[PDB]
Amino acid sequence: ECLTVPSGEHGEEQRRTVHYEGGAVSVHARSLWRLETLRVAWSGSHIR
Amino acid sequence: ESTSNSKNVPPDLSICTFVLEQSLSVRALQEMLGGGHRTLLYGHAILLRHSYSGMYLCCLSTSRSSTDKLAF
Amino acid sequence: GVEIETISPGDGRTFPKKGQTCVVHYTGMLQNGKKFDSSRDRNKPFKFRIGKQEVIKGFEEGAAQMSLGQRAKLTCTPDVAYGATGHPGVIPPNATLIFDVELLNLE
Amino acid sequence: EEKEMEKQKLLYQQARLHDRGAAEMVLQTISASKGETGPMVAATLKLGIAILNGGNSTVQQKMLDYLKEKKDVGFFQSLAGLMQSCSVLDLNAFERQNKDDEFTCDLFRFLQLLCEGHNSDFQNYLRTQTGNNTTVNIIISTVDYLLRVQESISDFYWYYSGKDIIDEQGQRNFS
Amino acid sequence: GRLLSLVEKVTYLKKSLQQLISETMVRWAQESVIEDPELVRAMFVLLHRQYDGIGGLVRALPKTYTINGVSVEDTINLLASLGQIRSLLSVRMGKEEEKLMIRGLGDIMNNKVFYQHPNLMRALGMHETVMEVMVNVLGGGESKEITFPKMVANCCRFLCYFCRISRQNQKAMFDHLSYLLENSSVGLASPAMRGSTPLDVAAASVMDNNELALALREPDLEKVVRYLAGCGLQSCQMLVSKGYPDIGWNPVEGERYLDFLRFAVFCNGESVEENANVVVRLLIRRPECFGPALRGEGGNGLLAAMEEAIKIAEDPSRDGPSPTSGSSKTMGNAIMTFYAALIDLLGRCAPEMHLIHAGKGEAIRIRSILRSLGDLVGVISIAFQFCPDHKAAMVLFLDRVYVQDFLLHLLEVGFLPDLRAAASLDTAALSATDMALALNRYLCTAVLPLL
Amino acid sequence: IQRKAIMHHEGHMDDGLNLSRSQHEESRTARVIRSTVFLFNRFIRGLDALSKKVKLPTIDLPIESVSLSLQDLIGYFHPPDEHLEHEDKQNRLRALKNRQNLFQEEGMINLVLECIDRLHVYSSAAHFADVAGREAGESWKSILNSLYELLAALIRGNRKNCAQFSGSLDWLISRLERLEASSGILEVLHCVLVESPEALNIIKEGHIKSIISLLDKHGRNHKVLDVLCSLCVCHGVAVRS
Amino acid sequence: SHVLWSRMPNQFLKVDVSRISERQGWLVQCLDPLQFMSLHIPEENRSVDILELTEQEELLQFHYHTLRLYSAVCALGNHRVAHALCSHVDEPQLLYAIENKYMPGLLRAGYYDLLIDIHLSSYATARLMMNNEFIVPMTEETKSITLFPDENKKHGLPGIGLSTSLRPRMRFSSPSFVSISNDCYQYSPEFPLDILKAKTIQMLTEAVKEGSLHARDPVGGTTEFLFVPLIKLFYTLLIMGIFHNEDLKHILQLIEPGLLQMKLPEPVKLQMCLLLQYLCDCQVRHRIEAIVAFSDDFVAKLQDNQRFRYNEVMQALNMSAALTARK
Amino acid sequence: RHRAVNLFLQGYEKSWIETEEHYFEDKLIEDLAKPGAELPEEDEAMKRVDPLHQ
């Protein structure tokens, strides 16, 4: 699977919801996240 | 990007990123007519790079901002 | 109808009978001098017996109104020609036709 | 001296080919073949062993340098899918018939000819692919193929383990 | 020596063109570094070809076929229809003259050439052309835009039956069964409710062949029983094909799979064991012959569902709520004929006692599992209780799965078929000559109880 | 498949989270989601919302920056400059196909190209010229033609995407009623037909005769091949119907 | 909006008339015909010579793309459209277009391709589809079709030699239509084929000498427009079997003892490869025809050996399975 | 006449006819597709880009 978000046919509030789909979205945009780590310096440290 | 309010809202660190692509003394000046993990000295010429958007922030003819009315 | 007009008539009386290949060597024309057909460029004399309804009856009636060796300027009309339908791609609707008909032989 | 001349003409014949990117063509075609068993890659791998044909160091290092330069995931992915796609004895079909192999031989012969001469660099890179984002263990894949061979031939014994002799189809399927 | 001297002349590398092409193409590639990859493609092609002149000969002998001078008119009509239909596939070619496709198919059916000659229609790839035209019709699901696949009629009802002259014509349709795996189509050009007329392609392909029914495989059939599991839905209205738009007669979805699988398991004489085993194994995981209401499953019991569908059948029409229109309606059927074809297939699957295997070769598990479904002894009530051909299935089941006390509960194959067959051979307006075969066939169902 | 997930107390033990990075080639995949997608969505959202007679400087109307934005989109979606070598050109085509399909699964068929068409709200650029500031419909041509170019380039580029214009043919008719961007309509058509016909199966007299009336106002486009003959034949590989 | 432009320096002429003017009543005469191609077009007209357009490049692309459209609607077999078209583009336009020497290469190749696309696009296409069948009948003509005409094992020639192959046929119609597309694709009308067969020989024998001299001026612009449309029409007419062994001997006399040794561009070599391909097709057809000629007497003599030592199969005694069958 | 002799010679062609007599082409065609004999006034002697390399 991957932590998918539903597509942008409903850009208002339903994009805040969550669903899982191990299909073709596992390469694509909606199954992508980011580790916006709180630390400023060494934010590109090896995360543990 | 205000990282002082890191707890109230996030800061976007990725857009703030910068990279030291090159650095030389001022005498390194040829004008067209590396070392590898060299150190960094004060007074030497520095080159920056915005990381994901490869736009080399550098000496450009920027004469657009007039908030102070004489400033680049 | 077929308002026949002679150009260089021959004997003037060898009219075509039934089952007689009018060996016609015409050059078909439209109004304005815009050509749409020709047998001289082909060197293939047109052939048709009478009554079998191959050609429009402009040719049939004019040939019947025509002798052997008779160069003539035929003048068909939309009722006998393709009419408001028109042979598509070439002929538009509601067209009056002209033919430099020249009957040669009958077999 | 006859064997020496044979090896010299062998290496000359190989030099007619791999000096013109024949090995690069071989790896390109294997990488394009994304784990499909076919005769095009069969002719490729025949050509690969032909240029190799005794552990030519030149085609070895050429192939390796090409792979490291390109970082091609598709080559080792293709070898993985190939060894997954390779066939087995299928004794049920043999039972119904009582009323694919040379491909794998040349595959593993090409893979052997990479590491011939104690070429440690293939022996690592065929394990790790350290210069690339992702990694594949070719060695595990041939090992898994060996296990799938083992279970089939063991069932093949256990069929005739109760019987007295073996027919010509049976000994051929053995061999 | 005749053949040998001819071979020496043919194997002369015979006939200037060769040396000319070989020197000029290599000179062309020599004298400049050439772009246009198609040119160098053709150059090296001709270069390889002029050495391998035999290669032109090897892929010509299977295609060429000699005929006599008499057959050089209908064969030219066949070649004309074939070049036409090659200008109706893809190349200069396709669909929109559906009349011309149908008419070329009709001329090709009516042609008198492959009747006499052993190998023309296979070598020319007529089957390839017809199947190509069918996929070009179909493309994908949800539409069936052209509802006239007489290509099905062509291949099934002529090509697989011209294989009496050459059985390897059916081999090609067995190879294209590999395409029917992905061209598993649900569309019927027949009476046409829902019932997959290109299943007739596979049926004619594995109709009667021990070798080819043995060469069948489980993934050819797992999907089929999955589709039959998909058939396990209730019947609500007259023809819910997928919603009953205006016309209501009768839905049938499950039967034709069973009709195919009958051919799949059952050879000419005795049935097949390699297939029937895995068949019943897969059925027992998902046995979805769900009638109106019984325990455990929906149905899995014939008499209750058959009597309920007979209440639906007789006084109403095919549907339950409809005004009394049903007779010879082969919703009555798909609830009666569905179980009929089911039990026909099942009787065809299992073996007999005192056979080659007298229940001593692991056929006992399957014969017990059959015997665990009793209602089976109770099917004599069904064997008395419109279609007389349904009861052929259950009597075949009793014959194949199943002492004279059991004969003598009935005392006969059935007293009513006996009387009705003795009396239906007296010509009358009604109740006469409908059963000139519908119960005169029951010698085929009644004689084998001789023993 | 729709396994919605909730932060349970413990829940299932066998809920392991394996990972898959944006690998080295997918540095571009990591790039575009931040660079070309979210910002472009916000820009065109503000611009489209302000096309509805909303007060100009209150919400996003940076027409210089929307212009530079779509310029950067077009330069970023540029063709690979054919003169280059085989390998790097085909890898640029790979990257182009990847960003195109990543846009696609982000919503080209539903969101992005819908926003391009929903930005095409121009009754007349001259009438709009004296409504909102001093400029509404200057580079309408640029956005329309160029983003419709990369649209059909996507449809071409991955060989079964015949999705928006061949699929939603009403939005193709939304071009044929306007008749200024006749440059990319063929770009949809000729790449559709080598794949499979869906655009051509429904067009009719009312489209072709309007195209002919347009042709009377024309001197033979010089891709008259690729529009009007590929309307028929598809350049030597043809569907009959 | 154009402007009526006052200074129009452009193509005048090169040949007026061979008029003669004698005395004795001031007799004048001219027995030397000449024709030229006008231009007057319903959606926009401009009466000029076709040779007048080599300077201006706003109607050349117009006429060129319309030629391509005309060849497109008449593509892959569509004969109603050719019957309508042939009114517009009657044959002597085509014959003068191929035969003229001053015209641009674009409209040259367009006119040529349009001719092929209403003349040699469905029959030739069809027999190419059926070329790789080699369906044989067994006749006495199919027995003197041996590998060599001579005992010397001489190299033969591909185009000459009997075929005895059930090739599909050629039929025709007339422009004023009846039975417009039933089976009529020699042309949409009837085309005079032999005059074109002579004209292609004439123009190829012209172009070999035009290109031998390294001329500044080929016919249309460059040598590609000279040789390509001519040679592709020659290819279409060669594969149809219209050419005779005298024509084929002359064709070999061009190139065997030539055109191939000449410098040429790449898309000309592209077509020479197809010519050589059809030569090899003719040779292979001759080969298997000779093999069938052998196979008749061989199967006869060999089943005669079974008939010699008569041997039989199950109770239907002396069946033809003894000769040829298994079942 | 019949197809049977055509397939006779089909089976005969693989066994009695096809051999090294024309499968000697492999080394010869590569000896003749390697050279690239030209004099382009920049090569050492020949091999602009040989046919096999193309």
- Contact call for residues C66 and C15 (beta carbons, < 8 A): yes
CB contact under 8 A, F35 and B53: yes
- Contact call for residues D156 and D91 (beta carbons, < 8 A): yes
H-assigned helices in E217-267: 222-230, 255-265
Tokens for D127, please give them: 């394990």
Following DSSP, what letter does each residue of chain C receive, concatenated? -----EEE-SSS-----TT----B---EEEGGG-B---STTTT--B---SSS-SS-HHHHHHHHT--TT-EEEEE--TTTSSTTT--TTT--SS--EEEEEEB----
**Which of H7, H8, H17 is the best residue to mutate to test the E interface, defined by the most E CB atoms within 10 Å of its own CB?**
H17
Nearest to E199 by CA among E274, E252, E125: E252
Q: Residue C42 belongs to what domain range? A: 1-107
Distance from the Cα of E408 to chain G's closest Cα (Å) equals 46
Contacts of H27 in chain D (CB under 8 A): 13
- Contact call for residues E117 and E65 (beta carbons, < 8 A): yes
F217: which residues sit within 8 A by CB, 6+ positions away? none
User: Measured between alpha carbons, how far is G34 from E269 in angstroms, rounded to an integer?
Assistant: 86
C64: which residues sit within 8 A by CB, 6+ positions away? C15, C16, C50
User: Measured between alpha carbons, how far is E359 from E126 in angstroms, rounded to an integer?
Assistant: 47
How many Cβ atoms are within 10 Å of D113's Cβ, its own excluded? 22
Number of domains in chain C: 1
Contacts of H34 in chain D (CB under 8 A): 16
E84-94 as b/e: b if 16+ CB within 10 A: bbbbbbbbbbb
Strand partners, C35: C29
Nearest to E29 by CA among G16, G109, G273: G273
CB contact under 8 A, A40 and B6: yes
> What is the CA angle F109-F113-F115, rounded to 5?
120
Half-sphere exposure of F220 (CA within 13 A, CB side): 18
Q: What is the dihedral of CA E285, E287, E288, E293, to 10 degrees?
A: -120
For G92, which of C36, C41, C54 is closest by C-beta distance? Answer: C41
- Contact call for residues C2 and C76 (beta carbons, < 8 A): yes
Nearest CA in chain G to F239: G76
Q: Confirm or reject contact between D9 and chain H (CB < 8 A).
A: no
> What is the CA angle E31-E32-E35, rounded to 5?
145
User: Measured between alpha carbons, how far is G248 from F196 in angstroms, rounded to an integer?
Assistant: 43
Nearest to F27 by CA among F89, F99, F106, F103: F99
Nearest CA in chain E to F237: E91
Rg over CA atoms, chain D = 19
Distance from the Cα of E86 to chain H's closest Cα (Å) equals 25
- Contact call for residues E288 and E231 (beta carbons, < 8 A): yes
E321: which residues sit within 8 A by CB, 6+ positions away? none
Strand partners, A4: A19
- Contact call for residues H50 and D20 (beta carbons, < 8 A): yes
Half-sphere exposure of G45 (CA within 13 A, CB side): 4
CB contact under 8 A, G69 and F228: yes
Exactly one of C56, C59, C91, C98 is catalytic; name it: C56
Residue E244 exposed, middle or buried by CB count within 10 Å (0-12, 13-18, 19+): middle
CB contact under 8 A, H3 and E26: no
Contacts of B3 in chain A (CB under 8 A): 40
What CATH number should be reported for the domain holding residue C45? 3.10.50.40
- Contact call for residues C64 and C83 (beta carbons, < 8 A): no
* DSSP-derived 3-state class of residue G94: helix
At B67, which amino acid appears?
T
- Contact call for residues C89 and G86 (beta carbons, < 8 A): no
User: Measured between alpha carbons, how far is G223 from G207 in angstroms, rounded to an integer?
Assistant: 9
User: Measured between alpha carbons, how far is G225 from F225 in angstroms, rounded to an integer?
Assistant: 20
Tokens for E225, please give them: 């029983």
Nearest to D54 by CA among D22, D2, D21, D8: D8
Residue C46 annotated among the catalytic residues of the structure: no
Q: Confirm or reject contact between G172 and chain C (CB < 8 A).
A: no
Residue C100 annotated among the catalytic residues of the structure: no
Please give the helix or strand (H or E) that residue D173 lies within, else none.
helix D168-174
User: Measured between alpha carbons, how far is G62 from G53 in angstroms, rounded to an integer?
Assistant: 11
User: Measured between alpha carbons, how far is G192 from G323 in angstroms, rounded to an integer?
Assistant: 52
Tokens for E60, please give them: 């010509």
Distance from the Cα of G170 to chain H's closest Cα (Å) equals 29
| Residue that the structure tokens 């490049």 belong to | G57
Residue C36 annotated among the catalytic residues of the structure: yes
Contacts of E274 in chain D (CB under 8 A): 92, 95-96
F202: which residues sit within 8 A by CB, 6+ positions away? F169
Q: What is the dihedral of CA E14, E16, E19, E20, to 10 degrees?
A: -140
* DSSP-derived 3-state class of residue E59: coil
Distance, CA of F56 to chain centre: 27
The sign of the dihedral angle between the CA atoms of E84, E89, E93, E94 is positive
- Contact call for residues C64 and C16 (beta carbons, < 8 A): yes
Nearest to G260 by CA among G276, G245, G282: G276
Rg over CA atoms, chain F = 21
For E79, which of G158, G166, G267 is closest by C-beta distance? Answer: G166
Residue C98 annotated among the catalytic residues of the structure: no
- Contact call for residues G52 and G63 (beta carbons, < 8 A): no
Distance from the Cα of H5 to chain D's closest Cα (Å) equals 30
- Contact call for residues G286 and G161 (beta carbons, < 8 A): yes
Q: Confirm or reject contact between G246 and chain F (CB < 8 A).
A: no
**Which of E79, E116, E121, E122 is the best residue to mutate to test the G interface, defined by the most G CB atoms within 10 Å of its own CB?**
E79
Residue C41 annotated among the catalytic residues of the structure: no
Interface of D with E (CB under 8 A): 92, 95-96, 99
User: Measured between alpha carbons, how far is F154 from F100 in angstroms, rounded to an integer?
Assistant: 6
User: Measured between alpha carbons, how far is E445 from E449 in angstroms, rounded to an integer?
Assistant: 8
Question: How many contacts does F have with G, using Cβ atoms within 8 A?
Answer: 31
Strand partners, C100: C73
Distance from the Cα of F109 to chain A's closest Cα (Å) equals 10
Order of strands across the sheet that contains C28-30: C6-8, C71-75, C97-102, C28-30
Tokens for G9, please give them: 């320096």
F1: which residues sit within 8 A by CB, 6+ positions away? A20, A21, A22, A23
For chain G, list the contacting chains (3+ Cβ pairs, <8 Å). C, E, F, H
E182: which residues sit within 8 A by CB, 6+ positions away? none
Nearest to F221 by CA among F187, F171, F193: F187
CB contact under 8 A, F31 and B52: yes
For F4, which of A20, A24, A30 is closest by C-beta distance? Answer: A20
Q: Confirm or reject contact between A35 and chain F (CB < 8 A).
A: no
Tokens for E10, please give them: 């043919």
Resolution (A): 5.1
Nearest to D84 by CA among D140, D16, D12, D164: D140
For strand A19-20 and strand B22-24, is the pairing parallel, antiparallel, or unpaired?
unpaired
Nearest to E123 by CA among E168, E175, E57: E168
E269-291 as b/e: b if 16+ CB within 10 A: eebbbbbbbebbebbeeebbbbb
Distance from the Cα of G319 to chain H's closest Cα (Å) equals 17
- Contact call for residues D132 and D67 (beta carbons, < 8 A): no
Q: What is the dihedral of CA E302, E305, E311, E314, to 10 degrees?
A: -50
Tokens for E374, please give them: 């009793």
F33-58 as b/e: b if 16+ CB within 10 A: bbbbbeebbebbbbbbebbeeeeeee
CB contact under 8 A, F105 and A28: yes
Contacts of A43 in chain B (CB under 8 A): 13
- Contact call for residues C41 and C99 (beta carbons, < 8 A): no
For chain H, list the contacting chains (3+ Cβ pairs, <8 Å). D, E, G
Half-sphere exposure of D11 (CA within 13 A, CB side): 10
Exactly one of C4, C15, C36, C100 is catalytic; name it: C36
Residue C50 annotated among the catalytic residues of the structure: no
Strand partners, C24: C46, C103
Residue C46 exposed, middle or buried by CB count within 10 Å (0-12, 13-18, 19+): buried
- Contact call for residues E130 and E173 (beta carbons, < 8 A): no
Distance from the Cα of B72 to chain A's closest Cα (Å) equals 29
User: Measured between alpha carbons, how far is C46 from C51 in angstroms, rounded to an integer?
Assistant: 16
Experimental method used, please?
cryo-EM
Contacts of D21 in chain H (CB under 8 A): 53
Residue G233 exposed, middle or buried by CB count within 10 Å (0-12, 13-18, 19+): buried
Please give the helix or strand (H or E) that residue B45 lies within, else none.
strand B45-47
| Residue that the structure tokens 């195209």 belong to | F211
The sign of the dihedral angle between the CA atoms of A12, A18, A22, A28 is positive
CB contact under 8 A, F35 and B14: no
Contacts for C104-107: CB closer than 8 Å, 24+ residues apart: C104/C23, C104/C24, C104/C25, C104/C45, C104/C68, C104/C69, C105/C21, C105/C23, C105/C68, C106/C14, C106/C16, C106/C17, C106/C20, C106/C21, C106/C22, C106/C23, C106/C68, C107/C20, C107/C21, C107/C23
Please give the helix or strand (H or E) that residue G93 lies within, else none.
helix G91-99
Contacts of F224 in chain G (CB under 8 A): 65-66, 68-69
Nearest CA in chain B to F32: B52
Rg over CA atoms, chain G = 27
Rg over CA atoms, chain A = 14
CA distances from E100 to E83, E95, G276 (A): 12, 9, 36
CB contact under 8 A, H1 and G300: yes
CA distances from B14 to A32, A34, A44, F42, F72 (A): 15, 10, 10, 19, 20
Tokens for H51, please give them: 């046919």
SS3 string, E203-231, reads HHHCCCCHHHHHCCCHHHCHHHHHHHHHC
> What is the CA angle E173-E177-E179, rounded to 5?
115
